[PDB]
């Protein structure tokens, strides 16, 4: 959709500001912190299925997940479409490779952000993002050796 584009390719679109964070907070995390796009898509789809099963659960994070899942679906369908006009799966594979390379990390940050908001609570995530940013920006001379850990909620 129009959102989509604006967020994926340049512009001035911070999808996190409405939820109380900033692209800069999410950009502090190393990439290995996040699971794969397809792993996060599986989790996000489970969470959206539960918000459909019980409509009281629903929240903005669910709608953001839906939209993320659909943007990704849109790009995959664009790849499959390129894999028809040029009749060969190698072209499709190249488009999917380009998407993963250039936007993969953006999708993983976004998906983890709402997934983790829904499973740890928004405030836990927000505080954790600040802690990791503080730690990453601390001069290595005085900062603790282990970065902050996000701990799972006690049941």
């Amino acid at each position, epitope marked *: 959709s129009k959102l989509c584009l604006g967020w994926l390719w340049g512009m001035d679109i911070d999808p996190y500001k409405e939820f109380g964070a900033t692209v800069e907070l999410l950009s502090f995390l190393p990439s290995d912190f*996040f*699971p794969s796009v397809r*792993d996060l898509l599986d989790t996000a789809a489970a969470l959206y299925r539960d918000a459909l099963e019980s409509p009281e659960h629903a929240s903005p994070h669910h709608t953001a997940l839906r939209q993320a899942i659909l943007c990704w679906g849109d790009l995959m369908t664009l790849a499959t479409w390129v894999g028809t006009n040029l009749e060969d799966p190698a072209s499709r594979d190249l488009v999917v490779s380009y998407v993963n390379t250039n936007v*993969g990390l953006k999708f993983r940050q976004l998906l983890w952000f709402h997934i983790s908001a829904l499973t740890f609570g928004r405030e836990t995530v927000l505080e954790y993002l600040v802690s990791f940013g503080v730690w990453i920006r601390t001069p290595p001379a005085y900062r603790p050796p282990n970065a902050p850990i996000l701990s799972t909620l006690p049941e």
Partner: single-chain antibody
Amino acid sequence: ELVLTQTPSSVSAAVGGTVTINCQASQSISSRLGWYQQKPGQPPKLLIYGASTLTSGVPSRFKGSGSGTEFTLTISGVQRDDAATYYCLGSDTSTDTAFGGGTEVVVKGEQLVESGGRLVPPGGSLTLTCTVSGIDLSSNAISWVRQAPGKGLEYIGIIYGGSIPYYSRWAKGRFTISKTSTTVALKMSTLTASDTATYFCARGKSDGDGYAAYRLDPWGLGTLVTISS
């Protein structure tokens, strides 16, 4: 739903012969496959990750190949030190990640500590702990794998630096992986004789797309969990 079919189940070779183990995936997994070697009384050891990339120290006589659905491990100069059981580990997603059944190879002529294993009654519940040292728990995954006595490796689950857990379809609901600042814990409930096993945690290391579950190293020594009436 990933199934890895490893063949043959056992191979005898002479020192200097060549050993060939094939692994067939039921879905395309690209190159996300490891090869593991396990000697009696020891934890598994990662030989090869990404289907062809040898870990440091592994002799050149080992070579992995394949991608998609077809993979091969070949030991050319096979030596007495290579006698062992070998297992392939495929990862389609971190949920659909599975070991092959293993191949016994007979030849002729940074720290992890599990704890909490004990005798447990049928249908009871138990939590295992894995204490992590020299490993940043915010950028490395921790995986749980189990081995019933005299049987192969079974993938339980993994949890990423960003603390999203993933479970194989068979563990989903009876097993829960949690994380503190220093530990990764595995809680299992409804325990049956089928759960008696040694339980290993291992560090998963992500590729560029973030898949960690097929590259597991180092390993802990395991903790034995025995269901007894």
